[PDB]
Design a protein around this ligand. Structure first.
Ligand code: PUU
Ligand code: PUU
Lengths: 304, 304
């Protein structure tokens, strides 16, 4: 029993974190096989960030201008190439600690663990979600650029996120491991509006099932609803419309608890229209949407 | 910017997790140097747990009855000894992955990261606190026994907690790495009341400073208080009395923000007597007490 915002064990990812320097700029890189991936803004100065021309900027840079330091030893760079917003630096040594890995582009609503790094060194690990507006509410300071988000399936590490920038609003933005930004964001120092963020309905429902599993049942009520009626309520409260696929993914949790998905929706509907009246659910005074149905099953079953 | 319940990178601790079996019982062990530490209840059956005599039970066990499996390879056990509630099994091989480490007994109010393990395999990492009543609000399932709590100072891992049991109330209890339980708890299957839990006042104040640092300032008010007046309010709301040492530890955060500790106490006093009125602080609808002043400084400065 107990329900925590749990992150994946960060060991296989720590073994890939390197320091990448170019000019006066330093950030973190991801060393897998003989390639180091890092945000392409490592080639910029503070002035360059206002309106950068990365193609022109990269032409002024040679392999010897990229300093890759793994731990306290230098890696020799023998190739450099820009892929979207990431630089891929070919080093002459394969990382002996390279885990089994994939590069995956997660969907909004999905969660992942972030290993925050500064100067190639891991400082902490936390669990977060790709918000519906493609931002992440991370905890990142200056130097955190290059920190990666990932998921782990037994021995395979699926890298899904690489941190690039913090929006003026305190939220964070980044790319997949192929350098494509999640959302409309660009690696430029300019005003960038993150669209309207909504609440990941399927995740709140999953966390409501986790509450039932862990004994918190006050919110359960004598009512039920239809997907159409529930979605009218969801729209008003800035929640994502619940689809039949969301209901299907909630299937295992509905089966474990014996509470139909639509009955659980009616409980959420009343919590939305009535609030919590000062009560908490799993030690939280608000509705949590950063646990996917897979996360709740994994935590309540014990997948290693 | 951003404030998360961040855990320490779990890499140096994953490299020590082993599976320990004795009879039909299996749990996790901590392998450092040529010693494996695990809860002494690995020698019990389910029936034995009701009223166990560990000295008598251990006499029926030989070195060959303790099966230590590191990864997928067996470790040869050459010695076994009970220290308080932990068994120390002398293996013939030193762990090549043994980090720099200390065994420390944390105080209530302090935080640590937990690497939850099942069958010697890490499944997740999360940050939690040693509650004032010596329990932890962890997330642990059957098989999690032997999972450890720790802190990390650059390259040194201070192990502070080893998980032993879940109380009927869903909260968790365990020992330091010398086998001494935190609190009045015993490794027996009997009713065990965890005393009254209080809110770690210094931690809530620290997290209020973290909110100021990250832009959340609505709760700041035109008032101040005295330690004596504030403590009368704290007593009513089941908060720990704030001492001058707590004020001293809040010194760096008070200096960073320019908001005197007693002014911050007045803001907390009004939040206690008035609630939040539906507003949140750092994405939380309640007052958070699981970030120590050291944690807030570390997260807002970037200690690797
Ligand atoms: C916004 C801005 O001026 N910069 C320069 C640095 C950089 C940036 O955002 N870095 C940061 C990331 N994560 C937390 C940060 C907390 C503090 C400072 C910087 C952080 C950056 C990267 C791109 Cl792609 C576009 C713009 C900017
Ligand atoms: C309470 C009880 O019956 N047992 C037997 C197993 C064991 C125990 O608590 N284990 C567990 C720990 N953490 C989460 C657990 C979720 C589910 C099941 C078991 C969990 C234990 C250990 C001691 Cl020292 C004393 C009693 C008991």
């Amino acid at each position: 029993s107990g329900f925590r915002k749990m992150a994946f064990p960060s060991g296989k990812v720590e073994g890939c974190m390197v320091q990448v320097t170019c000019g006066t700029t330093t950030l973190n890189g991801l060393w897998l096989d003989d390639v180091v991936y890092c945000p392409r803004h490592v080639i910029c100065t503070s002035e360059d960030m206002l309106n950068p021309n990365y193609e022109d900027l990269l032409i002024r840079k040679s392999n010897h201008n990229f300093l890759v330091q793994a731990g306290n030893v230098q890696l020799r760079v023998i190739g450099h190439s820009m892929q979207n917003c990431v630089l891929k630096l070919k080093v002459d040594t394969a990382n002996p600690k390279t885990p089994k890995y994939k590069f995956v582009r997660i969907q909004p609503g999905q969660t992942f663990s972030v290993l925050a790094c500064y100067n190639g060194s891991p400082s902490g690990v936390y669990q977060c979600a790709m918000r519906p507006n493609f931002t992440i509410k991370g905890s990142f300071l200056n130097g955190s650029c290059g920190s990666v988000g990932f998921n782990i399936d037994y021995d395979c590490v699926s890298f899904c996120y690489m941190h690039h920038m913090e929006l003026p609003t305190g939220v964070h933005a980044g790319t997949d491991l192929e350098g494509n930004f999640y959302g409309p964001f660009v690696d430029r120092q300019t005003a960038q509006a993150a669209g309207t963020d909504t609440t990941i309905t399927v995740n709140v429902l999953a966390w409501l099932y986790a509450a039932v599993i862990n004994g918190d049942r006050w919110f359960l009520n004598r009512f039920t609803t239809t997907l159409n009626d529930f979605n009218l309520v969801a729209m008003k409260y800035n929640y994502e419309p619940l689809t039949q696929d969301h209901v299907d993914i909630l299937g295992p949790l509905s089966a474990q608890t014996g509470i139909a998905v639509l009955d659980m929706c009616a409980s959420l509907k009343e919590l939305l229209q009535n609030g919590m009246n000062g009560r908490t659910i799993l030690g939280s005074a608000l509705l949590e949407d950063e646990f996917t149905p897979f996360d709740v099953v994994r935590q309540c079953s014990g997948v290693t």
